[PDB]
From a paper:
The translocation and assembly module (TAM) plays a role in the transport and insertion of proteins into the bacterial outer membrane. The TAM is composed of two subunits, TamA an Omp85 family protein evolutionarily related to BamA and the enigmatic inner membrane-anchored protein TamB (Heinz et al., 2015). In E. coli, TamA and TamB have been shown to associate and, as TamB is embedded in the inner membrane via a signal anchor, it must span the periplasm to interact with TamA (Selkrig et al., 2012). Interaction between TamA and TamB occurs via the conserved C-terminal DUF490 domain of TamB and POTRA1 of TamA and is required for the proper functioning of the TAM in vitro (Selkrig et al., 2015, Shen et al., 2014).
In this work, we report the crystal structure of TamB963-1138 from E. coli, a region spanning half of the conserved DUF490 domain. One of these constructs, consisting of residues 963–1,138 of TamB (designated TamB963-1138) produced diffraction quality crystals and data was collected and anisotropically processed to 1.86–2.2 Å (Josts et al., 2014, Strong et al., 2006). As no homologs of TamB have been structurally characterized, selenomethionine-labeled protein was prepared, crystalized, and the structure was solved using single-wavelength anomalous dispersion (SAD). The crystal structure of TamB963-1138 revealed an elongated taco-shaped molecule consisting entirely of β sheet and random coil. This β taco structure is formed by two molecules of TamB963-1138, which interact via their N-terminal β strand to form a continuous 16-stranded curved β structure. Between the first and second β strands 29 residues lack electron density due to disorder. Proline residues 987 and 1,071 at the center of β strands 1 and 4 and glycine 1,035 at the center of β strand 2 create a discontinuity which kinks of the β sheet, facilitating the curvature of the β taco. The most striking feature of the TamB963-1138 crystal structure is that the interior surface of its β taco is populated entirely by aliphatic and aromatic residues, making this interior cavity highly hydrophobic. During purification of TamB963-1138 it was found that the detergent lauryldimethylamine N-oxide (LDAO) was required for stabilization of the domain. Electron density possibly attributable to the aliphatic chains of stabilizing LDAO molecules is evident inside the TamB963-1138 cavity.
Author numbering:
A (entry chain B): 977 to 996, 1026 to 1136
B (entry chain A): 975 to 995, 1025 to 1139
């Protein structure tokens, strides 16, 4: 069987989603990595230890969202803080995300702000009013 | 049915590759200064650049991998890689080879082999065995 261990740097990438064998890798997400997916347009940074063995894929580390905009479902929000903390299960990071109304938004009834926290399948969301 | 696209650049400053016994992407992979392979008697350091492109038709691989240093265990003997290049021109599992490896046969009158050179597509290569270390 083949194994691959190492360190990988991703200085730039573009990930878009359009509607219309064995490893241990440390992956460093560099300074021009952007995603456009599911209403989120964002820049991502961070570091992940990607372990793959017979049981499956493990992810440990942190992915951060230094800048982003979520525009979907009548809502236009600017990400003020965004962190995903992975502790093994790839589909279950801990979320800590804050976003506020885009003051340039054209839609009305856009929430003043939201915070989403907790494991991605047990999340909690706080929705704030304008003072 | 939704389309996933991935473009970008990947740098691999460190790696160890051991061999025991709808998505569109275009990636530039730069193989850096501490990438080594251990497989089938070959212990070698690798460098170079590969463009990996993937779409509905399949995977394509283009670029060049160099072997700046390596050794190869064949029969009871050891050969030191003097020059090594693999050229990828589309088919990922069929690079063009050009590899030269040498050993010293001069201790004994009988020992003849001074070098080996392997050239051609990886599935139908030619091997030249030389008694002069020169290969010219």
């Amino acid at each position: 069987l083949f194994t691959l261990d190492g360190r990988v740097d991703v200085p730039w990438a573009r990930i878009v989603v359009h509607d219309l064998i064995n490893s241990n890798l440390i992956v460093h997400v560099g300074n021009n990595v952007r995603i456009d997916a599911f209403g989120l347009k964002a820049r991502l940074t961070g570091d992940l230890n990607v372990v793959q063995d017979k049981q499956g894929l493990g992810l440990n580390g942190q992915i951060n969202i230094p800048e982003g905009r979520f525009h979907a479902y009548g809502q236009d929000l600017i990400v003020r803080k965004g962190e995903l903390l992975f502790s093994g299960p790839p589909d279950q990071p801990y979320l800590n995300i804050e976003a506020i109304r885009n003051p340039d938004a054209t839609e009305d009834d856009v929430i003043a702000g939201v915070r989403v926290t907790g494991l991605a399948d047990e999340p909690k969301a706080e929705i704030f009013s304008d003072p």
